Amino acid sequence: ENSEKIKVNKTLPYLVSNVIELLDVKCAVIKTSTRQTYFLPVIGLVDAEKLKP
């Protein structure tokens, strides 16, 4: 598990973004700083309490 999160988190450029809304059908919607809207069904390594639009 640490090997995989090393293989992901050592990718040091983090594109920053903004959470647009939060679906539940646990699903977050992202607009990056390049202004490209992204969907993701899998949130990742943050908790839904710490998120707000």
């Binding site: 040091l12 450029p13 983090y14 594109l15 920053v16 990056t32 700083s33 390049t34």
Partner: protein
Amino acid sequence: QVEDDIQQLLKKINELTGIKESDTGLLAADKQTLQSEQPLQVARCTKIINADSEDPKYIINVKQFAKFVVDLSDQVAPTDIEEGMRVGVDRNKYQIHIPLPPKIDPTVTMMQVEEKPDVTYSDVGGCKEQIEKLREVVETPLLHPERFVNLGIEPPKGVLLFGPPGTGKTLCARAVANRTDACFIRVIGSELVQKYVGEGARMVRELFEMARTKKACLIFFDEIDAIGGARFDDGAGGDNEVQRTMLELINQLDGFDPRGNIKVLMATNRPDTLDPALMRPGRLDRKIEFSLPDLEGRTHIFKIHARSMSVERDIRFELLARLCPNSTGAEIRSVCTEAGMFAIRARRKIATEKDFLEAVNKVIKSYAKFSATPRYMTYN
């Protein structure tokens, strides 16, 4: 002929003689060095928002692309990567390499003087007290911080100048700009008038950026009436952008961490429509003024404009000065040059007294209907 043909033969002999080296030797003055600059880097520049804790973990807005979280490379110092700092960032791996000076708004770069116009102190004789006071402010602390420290004072960091037009304001400024030794920075007052709202404010910001970067410099303001004089308030909303530019000029000049090693000279023709926030000392301290040269001043200015010209030295100059009661140095210059032009009517090499009398009754009594100072002596 002999010099011409022999110089042609010698110079073309050297030329056609080195032509043997030209056709025998077979840019590269940097080619191997430039191909060793091929392992160099493209190095895109950016802007930093903030840092993070326990680690570098730096955050960057590039300029338009996006905002990225980055790390520093190994050939950097972990200290001088502070916030709001234009740094060069790798294109591939997005890593910070070198911090640099900030954005200077290049239309503001072209008002540093970069030269020295040749104007000597001898050209403003007959104004001894004004030269003395302006010397005392501008020249002395940059060359001698000795009396000012060992007695414990602060010199007046601002001096305004005024008077009738054509009295020597511009000329005294240039006389300082000869012997300045500092980063003399010209500012025309109309440079702060742009198409868009609050843009001249940013110009003033960048002026004091350049001022705070380079220690012990001079900034010259020129015709500050365009920059802003009064805050006439009505139900129209008229002259307001100029007013905000003037207020931003006020605050970043003097107040709440004052200016540093910078001296401001202003020069106007009509010092009467000025908001007294500028008239408060601490910003504009010495009110040095230029009146008209009374009697001996014009004798001395005749000595100034006459010392390097073809005249008949058997004439006097006092009688010439006695016919010019309210006159500027510009009118004196016109008198001297026009007396020369009357000498060009005939074919002579020396002036006469009558030439200068023609010049006086040509300039003063004839064009005294215009004369530029019956309504600026009242400082309208």
